[PDB]
Design a protein around this nucleic acid. Structure first.
Ligand SMILES: [Zn+2]
Length: 273
DNA sequence: AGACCCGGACG
DNA sequence: CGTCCGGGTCTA
Protein backbone atom coordinates (compact mmCIF):
# COMPACT_ATOMS: atom_id res chain seq x y z
CA UNK A 1 0.00 0.00 0.00
CA UNK A 2 1.19 3.44 -1.00
CA UNK A 3 -0.36 6.83 -0.24
CA UNK A 4 -3.53 6.24 -2.32
CA UNK A 5 -4.16 2.76 -0.87
CA UNK A 6 -3.52 3.93 2.72
CA UNK A 7 -5.70 7.02 2.20
CA UNK A 8 -8.55 4.86 0.85
CA UNK A 9 -8.22 2.52 3.84
CA UNK A 10 -8.18 5.56 6.16
CA UNK A 11 -11.38 7.01 4.69
CA UNK A 12 -13.22 3.68 4.65
CA UNK A 13 -12.06 2.60 8.13
CA UNK A 14 -12.66 5.77 10.16
CA UNK A 15 -16.48 5.65 10.37
CA UNK A 16 -16.35 1.96 11.47
CA UNK A 17 -14.23 2.73 14.56
CA UNK A 18 -14.69 6.38 15.52
CA UNK A 19 -16.11 6.75 19.05
CA UNK A 20 -15.51 3.12 20.02
CA UNK A 21 -13.74 2.27 23.28
CA UNK A 22 -11.00 -0.36 23.53
CA UNK A 23 -11.68 -3.18 26.01
CA UNK A 24 -8.88 -5.58 25.07
CA UNK A 25 -5.90 -5.84 22.73
CA UNK A 26 -4.89 -9.35 21.71
CA UNK A 27 -1.55 -9.98 20.02
CA UNK A 28 -0.68 -13.18 18.15
CA UNK A 29 2.55 -12.07 16.46
CA UNK A 30 4.46 -9.85 18.92
CA UNK A 31 7.16 -8.85 16.40
CA UNK A 32 4.63 -6.45 14.83
CA UNK A 33 4.67 -4.46 18.06
CA UNK A 34 7.64 -2.07 17.93
CA UNK A 35 6.89 0.45 20.69
CA UNK A 36 6.54 -0.18 23.58
CA UNK A 37 8.54 -3.26 22.55
CA UNK A 38 6.91 -5.22 25.40
CA UNK A 39 3.59 -6.21 23.78
CA UNK A 40 2.04 -6.47 27.27
CA UNK A 41 2.64 -2.74 27.86
CA UNK A 42 1.38 -1.93 24.35
CA UNK A 43 -1.89 -3.78 25.06
CA UNK A 44 -2.31 -2.49 28.61
CA UNK A 45 -1.93 1.17 27.69
CA UNK A 46 -4.62 1.11 25.01
CA UNK A 47 -7.30 -0.47 27.19
CA UNK A 48 -9.96 2.11 28.08
CA UNK A 49 -9.02 4.57 25.32
CA UNK A 50 -11.55 5.69 22.72
CA UNK A 51 -10.82 6.09 19.02
CA UNK A 52 -11.18 9.81 18.30
CA UNK A 53 -9.75 10.06 14.79
CA UNK A 54 -7.71 8.46 12.07
CA UNK A 55 -5.12 10.32 10.05
CA UNK A 56 -2.53 9.37 7.45
CA UNK A 57 1.10 10.47 7.21
CA UNK A 58 2.89 9.08 4.14
CA UNK A 59 2.02 5.37 4.11
CA UNK A 60 1.34 5.36 7.89
CA UNK A 61 -2.05 5.29 9.57
CA UNK A 62 -2.29 7.36 12.74
CA UNK A 63 -5.08 6.22 15.08
CA UNK A 64 -5.83 9.08 17.48
CA UNK A 65 -6.98 7.75 20.84
CA UNK A 66 -7.26 9.63 24.17
CA UNK A 67 -3.67 10.06 25.46
CA UNK A 68 -2.02 8.07 22.68
CA UNK A 69 -1.53 7.76 18.93
CA UNK A 70 -1.13 4.32 17.39
CA UNK A 71 1.12 4.51 14.31
CA UNK A 72 0.47 1.57 11.98
CA UNK A 73 2.31 0.59 8.76
CA UNK A 74 0.74 -2.10 6.56
CA UNK A 75 3.97 -2.65 4.59
CA UNK A 76 3.26 -5.15 1.78
CA UNK A 77 0.18 -7.10 2.88
CA UNK A 78 -1.28 -5.51 6.04
CA UNK A 79 -4.99 -4.77 6.19
CA UNK A 80 -7.76 -3.88 8.65
CA UNK A 81 -11.35 -5.09 8.94
CA UNK A 82 -14.07 -4.55 11.55
CA UNK A 83 -16.21 -7.52 12.55
CA UNK A 84 -18.02 -9.21 15.44
CA UNK A 85 -16.19 -10.72 18.46
CA UNK A 86 -18.57 -13.68 18.10
CA UNK A 87 -17.15 -14.86 14.75
CA UNK A 88 -13.97 -16.93 14.27
CA UNK A 89 -10.95 -14.93 13.14
CA UNK A 90 -9.80 -15.07 9.52
CA UNK A 91 -6.39 -16.63 8.76
CA UNK A 92 -3.29 -14.49 9.38
CA UNK A 93 -4.94 -12.24 11.97
CA UNK A 94 -2.08 -11.02 14.18
CA UNK A 95 -3.55 -8.18 16.28
CA UNK A 96 -7.12 -7.60 17.44
CA UNK A 97 -8.53 -4.57 19.23
CA UNK A 98 -11.73 -5.49 21.01
CA UNK A 99 -14.29 -2.72 21.55
CA UNK A 100 -16.86 -2.38 24.36
CA UNK A 101 -19.70 -2.74 21.80
CA UNK A 102 -18.70 -6.29 20.88
CA UNK A 103 -17.04 -5.35 17.58
CA UNK A 104 -13.33 -5.75 16.85
CA UNK A 105 -10.69 -4.09 14.70
CA UNK A 106 -8.70 -6.97 13.17
CA UNK A 107 -5.24 -6.57 11.69
CA UNK A 108 -4.31 -9.23 9.13
CA UNK A 109 -0.91 -9.52 7.47
CA UNK A 110 0.13 -12.71 5.68
CA UNK A 111 3.84 -11.73 5.52
CA UNK A 112 3.95 -10.28 9.06
CA UNK A 113 5.91 -7.20 7.85
CA UNK A 114 3.59 -4.55 9.39
CA UNK A 115 4.56 -2.43 12.36
CA UNK A 116 2.78 -0.71 15.25
CA UNK A 117 4.16 2.02 17.51
CA UNK A 118 2.21 3.73 20.30
CA UNK A 119 3.28 7.08 21.81
CA UNK A 120 1.62 9.95 23.66
CA UNK A 121 0.02 12.09 20.89
CA UNK A 122 2.38 15.01 21.39
CA UNK A 123 5.41 12.67 21.06
CA UNK A 124 4.47 10.66 17.96
CA UNK A 125 5.71 13.15 15.35
CA UNK A 126 9.17 13.52 16.92
CA UNK A 127 9.86 9.78 17.34
CA UNK A 128 10.41 6.91 14.88
CA UNK A 129 8.93 6.08 12.46
CA UNK A 130 7.27 9.44 11.69
CA UNK A 131 10.21 11.70 12.62
CA UNK A 132 12.28 11.18 9.45
CA UNK A 133 9.36 11.43 6.98
CA UNK A 134 9.53 13.78 4.00
CA UNK A 135 6.73 16.11 2.91
CA UNK A 136 3.22 15.15 1.88
CA UNK A 137 3.24 15.15 -1.96
CA UNK A 138 -0.19 16.82 -2.20
CA UNK A 139 0.95 19.66 0.11
CA UNK A 140 2.77 22.96 -0.63
CA UNK A 141 5.73 21.45 1.28
CA UNK A 142 6.42 19.29 -1.78
CA UNK A 143 7.55 21.50 -4.66
CA UNK A 144 9.82 21.31 -7.70
CA UNK A 145 12.36 23.27 -5.60
CA UNK A 146 12.20 20.67 -2.80
CA UNK A 147 12.66 17.87 -5.33
CA UNK A 148 15.52 19.68 -7.13
CA UNK A 149 17.35 20.25 -3.81
CA UNK A 150 17.56 16.51 -3.13
CA UNK A 151 18.15 15.49 -6.76
CA UNK A 152 21.22 17.67 -7.28
CA UNK A 153 23.05 16.29 -4.22
CA UNK A 154 23.09 12.64 -5.37
CA UNK A 155 24.14 10.38 -8.25
CA UNK A 156 21.70 7.67 -7.06
CA UNK A 157 19.01 6.76 -9.60
CA UNK A 158 15.94 8.99 -9.80
CA UNK A 159 13.88 5.89 -8.91
CA UNK A 160 15.86 5.34 -5.69
CA UNK A 161 15.39 9.04 -4.89
CA UNK A 162 11.56 8.92 -5.18
CA UNK A 163 11.41 5.67 -3.17
CA UNK A 164 13.26 7.41 -0.29
CA UNK A 165 10.62 8.31 2.28
CA UNK A 166 12.77 11.21 3.55
CA UNK A 167 12.65 12.89 0.11
CA UNK A 168 8.88 12.82 -0.27
CA UNK A 169 6.29 10.76 1.57
CA UNK A 170 3.97 8.15 0.10
CA UNK A 171 5.54 6.90 -3.15
CA UNK A 172 6.20 3.22 -3.78
CA UNK A 173 7.02 0.90 -6.64
CA UNK A 174 3.83 1.47 -8.62
CA UNK A 175 3.61 5.25 -8.42
CA UNK A 176 7.32 5.85 -8.90
CA UNK A 177 7.32 3.86 -12.19
CA UNK A 178 4.08 5.53 -13.33
CA UNK A 179 5.24 9.06 -12.48
CA UNK A 180 8.53 8.55 -14.30
CA UNK A 181 6.76 7.22 -17.40
CA UNK A 182 4.32 10.14 -17.38
CA UNK A 183 7.23 12.61 -17.01
CA UNK A 184 9.21 10.89 -19.81
CA UNK A 185 12.22 10.05 -17.61
CA UNK A 186 14.06 6.69 -17.47
CA UNK A 187 14.08 5.30 -13.92
CA UNK A 188 17.82 4.49 -13.99
CA UNK A 189 18.78 8.12 -14.74
CA UNK A 190 21.06 9.58 -12.10
CA UNK A 191 18.96 12.08 -10.10
CA UNK A 192 21.64 14.77 -10.61
CA UNK A 193 21.24 14.35 -14.41
CA UNK A 194 17.68 15.74 -14.43
CA UNK A 195 17.18 19.19 -15.94
CA UNK A 196 15.09 21.92 -14.34
CA UNK A 197 12.35 21.21 -16.88
CA UNK A 198 12.46 17.47 -16.08
CA UNK A 199 12.21 18.16 -12.33
CA UNK A 200 9.18 20.41 -12.93
CA UNK A 201 7.53 17.78 -15.15
CA UNK A 202 8.28 15.00 -12.66
CA UNK A 203 6.79 17.00 -9.80
CA UNK A 204 3.66 17.74 -11.86
CA UNK A 205 3.17 14.07 -12.80
CA UNK A 206 3.86 12.83 -9.28
CA UNK A 207 1.13 15.12 -7.92
CA UNK A 208 -1.30 14.25 -10.74
CA UNK A 209 -0.72 10.47 -10.48
CA UNK A 210 -1.19 10.36 -6.70
CA UNK A 211 -4.32 12.50 -6.86
CA UNK A 212 -5.85 10.41 -9.63
CA UNK A 213 -5.08 7.19 -7.74
CA UNK A 214 -6.77 8.48 -4.56
CA UNK A 215 -9.85 9.37 -6.65
CA UNK A 216 -9.92 5.83 -8.04
CA UNK A 217 -9.60 4.13 -4.63
CA UNK A 218 -6.03 2.94 -5.14
CA UNK A 219 -4.46 0.24 -7.32
CA UNK A 220 -5.48 -3.37 -6.84
CA UNK A 221 -2.68 -5.28 -8.56
CA UNK A 222 -2.45 -8.36 -6.29
CA UNK A 223 -4.03 -8.20 -2.84
CA UNK A 224 -4.98 -4.62 -1.95
CA UNK A 225 -8.63 -3.87 -1.13
CA UNK A 226 -10.32 -1.07 0.86
CA UNK A 227 -11.80 -1.64 4.34
CA UNK A 228 -15.03 -3.00 2.78
CA UNK A 229 -12.94 -5.44 0.70
CA UNK A 230 -13.54 -3.52 -2.52
CA UNK A 231 -10.79 -3.39 -5.14
CA UNK A 232 -9.47 0.00 -6.30
CA UNK A 233 -9.71 0.85 -10.02
CA UNK A 234 -6.51 2.76 -10.65
CA UNK A 235 -4.85 -0.43 -11.98
CA UNK A 236 -6.77 0.21 -15.22
CA UNK A 237 -4.94 3.52 -15.56
CA UNK A 238 -1.40 2.16 -15.31
CA UNK A 239 0.89 2.84 -18.24
CA UNK A 240 3.84 0.65 -17.22
CA UNK A 241 3.62 -1.06 -13.82
CA UNK A 242 3.05 -4.80 -14.38
CA UNK A 243 2.68 -4.28 -18.15
CA UNK A 244 6.02 -5.78 -19.25
CA UNK A 245 5.76 -7.35 -22.71
CA UNK A 246 2.57 -5.42 -23.51
CA UNK A 247 2.46 -2.45 -25.90
CA UNK A 248 2.93 1.04 -24.52
CA UNK A 249 -0.47 2.75 -24.45
CA UNK A 250 1.09 5.84 -26.02
CA UNK A 251 3.60 4.58 -28.62
CA UNK A 252 3.03 0.81 -28.89
CA UNK A 253 6.64 -0.10 -27.97
CA UNK A 254 6.74 -3.15 -25.66
CA UNK A 255 7.06 -2.20 -22.00
CA UNK A 256 10.29 -3.48 -20.44
CA UNK A 257 11.08 -4.70 -16.94
CA UNK A 258 14.47 -4.56 -15.26
CA UNK A 259 15.85 -4.18 -11.72
CA UNK A 260 16.64 -0.64 -10.50
CA UNK A 261 17.32 0.28 -6.86
CA UNK A 262 16.78 -3.43 -6.05
CA UNK A 263 13.15 -3.26 -7.27
CA UNK A 264 11.21 -4.56 -10.29
CA UNK A 265 11.13 -1.61 -12.65
CA UNK A 266 8.80 -1.00 -15.60
CA UNK A 267 9.35 1.54 -18.35
CA UNK A 268 8.83 2.40 -22.01
CA UNK A 269 12.23 2.71 -23.69
CA UNK A 270 10.76 5.10 -26.28
CA UNK A 271 8.62 7.47 -24.17
CA UNK A 272 11.22 7.68 -21.40
CA UNK A 273 14.66 9.19 -21.89
C1' DA B 1 21.59 -6.29 -0.10
C1' DG B 2 19.69 -8.83 3.56
C1' DA B 3 16.28 -9.68 6.58
C1' DC B 4 11.62 -10.25 7.90
C1' DC B 5 7.70 -13.79 6.08
C1' DC B 6 4.07 -16.19 3.27
C1' DG B 7 1.48 -18.09 -0.52
C1' DG B 8 0.44 -17.76 -5.64
C1' DA B 9 1.74 -18.45 -10.23
C1' DC B 10 4.40 -20.83 -13.29
C1' DG B 11 7.87 -24.38 -15.30
C1' DC C 1 8.20 -29.65 -6.05
C1' DG C 2 11.23 -25.78 -7.00
C1' DT C 3 11.82 -21.33 -8.39
C1' DC C 4 10.61 -16.65 -8.72
C1' DC C 5 7.42 -12.97 -7.65
C1' DG C 6 5.42 -9.28 -4.63
C1' DG C 7 1.89 -1.67 -3.11
C1' DG C 8 7.98 -1.74 2.39
C1' DT C 9 11.97 -0.67 4.30
C1' DC C 10 14.50 -1.14 8.59
C1' DT C 11 19.62 -2.44 9.66
C1' DA C 12 24.05 -4.55 8.01
ZN1 LIG D 1 5.88 4.50 -25.12
Amino acid sequence: PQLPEVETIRRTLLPLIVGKTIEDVRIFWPNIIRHPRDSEAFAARMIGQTVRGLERRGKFLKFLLDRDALISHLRMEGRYAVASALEPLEPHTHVVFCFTDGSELRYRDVRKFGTMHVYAKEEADRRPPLAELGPEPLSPAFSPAVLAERAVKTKRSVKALLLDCTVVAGFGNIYVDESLFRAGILPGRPAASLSSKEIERLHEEMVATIGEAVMKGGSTVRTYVNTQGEAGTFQHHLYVYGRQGNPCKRCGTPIEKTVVAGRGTHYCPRCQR
